[PDB]
Structures are given as structure tokens and as C-alpha cells.
């Protein structure tokens, strides 16, 4: 049904390719932590390209024409727009199925975030090559919302730390129960039939 994707350590083009392919099949995919999406190349190079993209505007009326978003979620959404056939009623429905969020929303705090392996920085890039943060690019150009998003992100990371101790305590309790007696009769059958 719904898919929740991490954005930490992912590449823009690879993640946009996989999302734009899997959204045409009907799986309602949502990319969360969009400010953490890495972009290969030098950061001055990437903001020079984005400054040229901002320079692209209609001279007769800048409103009626090229819209230029600064938030990284809307940057990724424009990247998926430029790849889906949005002028027809297939890519428009796919963009309606796609949702994008900066930071992490409260339902996506609870719902588990997937990590796509083929779109990873570590898999796709040599580690001696330069990179750039889309959130750093957005804070440098236009998107003035890093002081709120980073604060709420550290708040939910503290919430995750206060949940993980309880989860690890419950895991230690259930492994103490597995260390305890009178479960092995089914475990012999399980090991002989693929534990």
C-alpha cells in the first residue's frame, strides 16, 4: 500500500528514478527526510546550476510562467514532475499519489522508514568524490526553515532514543525468556525443519 522512504544518504536522481518508476505502478510512496538527500558534485557547482535555474524566468511576467521552489521537498517534487508525464492524466495521478515532506511528520515518526539500497551515496559514489546536501543548498538559497526543522528533528531523535531503550529492554526480556526452559521441544522440530 503505502511506502515510507528515508532520505538520509540517498542521491537525488537515483531516488527520483526509483520513486517515479514505482509511483506509476500504484504504490503510494512518500519520501521523508528530504533535506538529507545528497547530490553528487561540488556544492558551489550545484548552487551555480541552481542559480542559473533561478535566472531562468519569463521577462514579460515572472508569475505567469516559471515557478521556482526553494524548499527541498518541492525541489524533489519538481524533479519527479520533470520525469513523469504530468501533462497527461497518468503522471498527474502519479503526482497526486506521491507525497513529499521535509522533516518527519508525526505519522511517519511511527511508521517505519525504508532505505533504498541502489540509490545510496555509499553504493553509487566513490567516497573520494565531492557531494552536497540538498538541505544545505535550500538553506543557502531561499528555504529559511532549517532552524525549525533541525530543532524538531533533534526532538524526534531524542524521542527515538527514549523509545529504543524501552524496545531493547523488551528484547532483553524476551531473550531471557528464550534462555529459560520448556521451549526446546518445539525448537528441535524448528531446527530440523529450518529454524
Amino acid at each position: 500500500q503505502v511506502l515510507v522512504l528515508d532520505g538520509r544518504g540517498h542521491l537525488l536522481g537515483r531516488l527520483a528514478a526509483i520513486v517515479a518508476k514505482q509511483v506509476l505502478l500504484g504504490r503510494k510512496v512518500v519520501v521523508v527526510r528530504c533535506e538529507g538527500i545528497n547530490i553528487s558534485g561540488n556544492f558551489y557547482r550545484n548552487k551555480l546550476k541552481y542559480l542559473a535555474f533561478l535566472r531562468k524566468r519569463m521577462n514579460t511576467n515572472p508569475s505567469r510562467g516559471p515557478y521556482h521552489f526553494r524548499a527541498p521537498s518541492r525541489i524533489f517534487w519538481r524533479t519527479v514532475r520533470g520525469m513523469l508525464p504530468h501533462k497527461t492524466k497518468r503522471g498527474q495521478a502519479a503526482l497526486d499519489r506521491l507525497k513529499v515532506f521535509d522533516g518527519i511528520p508525526p505519522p511517519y515518526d511511527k511508521k517505519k522508514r525504508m532505505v533504498v539500497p541502489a540509490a545510496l551515496k555509499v553504493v553509487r559514489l566513490k567516497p573520494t568524490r565531492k557531494f552536497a546536501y540538498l538541505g544545505r543548498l535550500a538553506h543557502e538559497v531561499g528555504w529559511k526553515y532549517q532552524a525549525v526543522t533541525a530543532t524538531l528533528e533533534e526532538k524526534r531523535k531524542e524521542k527515538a532514543k527514549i523509545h529504543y531503550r524501552k524496545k531493547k529492554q523488551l528484547m532483553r526480556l524476551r531473550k531471557q525468556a528464550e534462555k529459560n526452559v520448556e521451549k526446546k521441544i518445539d525448537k528441535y522440530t524448528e531446527v530440523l525443519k529450518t529454524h
Partner: protein, 175 residues
């Protein structure tokens, strides 16, 4: 030549036609590397036409044979002589390759001359192939592969592009 796939070593011998002006042609011999024996025969006609007064009509090929490796299980060192033609002018070249068989070493030679110097197979002419021993290699790369008790790990080994599912909670640790 296309040099498609791995190369093969062919011993091709050829001679002139029996003529009343000169019977018993000297039956020359070459060592042609080619993907198959038809390309070996044609490149043999090319080289013998450039060397001596021979063409396909006034000559014939006596024998064309596959040459198998004398020791495929031995990691050997091969020096290759090259008469490639660059964009400005042709040049002579000596290269070295550590590989198992002669056909594989000349295959690596064609692939590497296509990689670095942008030389097509139209321009590369293999002058001579010779197995060279240790302590005669001019190249520092092969000279530093010459190590007994050699130790190296495999740092940052990433693999399996989407053989695993495209969507997971994993985050693959390298090495």
C-alpha cells in the same frame, strides 16, 4: 578486426602459387591473433601483403590452426610490441601484461589500447609477443605485483545492485 570477445592465437602459413617461373614457394609462417580463423586468414593476407610480394589471387594458405596455451595454469608475464596509429602519427610501443594465456594477454592489450590511447582495432598492429621472465620487467605495476607473501585486503567492496529488494530497512556495511 572487431576484436569481439576474447582473442585467439592462430598459426597461419601461406605460400605463392606453383608457377613455371618459380616452383616450390618458400611457405612463410606467421602468428596471427584474431577472434576467429576467418579474421586470422584475412589479417594474415594483410600482413603478408605489407611484408612481401603476395596477394590472395597469386597465393594460397596452406594451413590455419588454433594454437592452445603451453601452460594455462601458470600466471605469466608477456611483453607486447605495438605499431598503433594515433591521430597525429603512428608510434612504436612496448607494453607488459601479467596474465595466464597469450590470447588473454593480447586481449587485455587490445582492450587497454582502446581504453587509454583511444586506439581502434583498425590501427593496432601487434608486432611481437614474448613471454618475459622475472627481474626483466620494465613496468613498475608488474614489478610491484612481483611479490612473494603478498598481502592486500578488499576495502569498500559494494555489490549486488538490486538483487536484494529495492525497498528495505537495511543499510549495507562494507567489508
Amino acid at each position: 578486426m572487431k576484436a569481439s570477445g576474447t582473442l585467439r592465437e592462430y598459426k597461419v602459413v601461406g605460400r605463392c602459387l606453383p608457377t613455371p617461373k618459380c616452383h616450390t614457394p618458400p611457405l612463410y609462417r606467421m602468428r596471427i591473433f584474431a577472434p576467429n580463423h576467418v579474421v586470422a586468414k584475412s589479417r594474415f593476407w594483410y600482413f603478408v601483403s605489407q611484408l612481401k610480394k603476395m596477394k590472395k589471387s597469386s597465393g594460397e594458405i596452406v594451413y590455419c590452426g588454433q594454437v592452445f596455451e603451453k601452460s594455462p595454469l601458470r600466471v605469466k608475464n608477456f611483453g607486447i610490441w605495438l605499431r598503433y596509429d594515433s591521430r597525429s602519427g603512428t608510434h612504436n610501443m612496448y607494453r607488459e601484461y601479467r596474465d595466464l594465456t597469450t590470447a588473454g594477454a593480447v586481449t587485455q592489450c587490445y582492450r587497454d589500447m582502446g581504453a587509454r590511447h583511444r586506439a581502434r582495432a583498425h590501427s593496432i598492429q601487434i608486432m611481437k609477443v614474448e613471454e618475459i621472465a622475472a627481474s626483466k620487467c620494465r613496468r613498475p605495476a608488474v614489478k610491484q605485483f612481483h611479490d612473494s607473501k603478498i598481502k592486500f585486503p578488499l576495502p569498500h567492496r559494494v555489490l549486488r545492485r538490486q538483487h536484494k529488494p529495492r525497498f528495505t530497512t537495511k543499510r549495507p556495511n562494507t567489508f
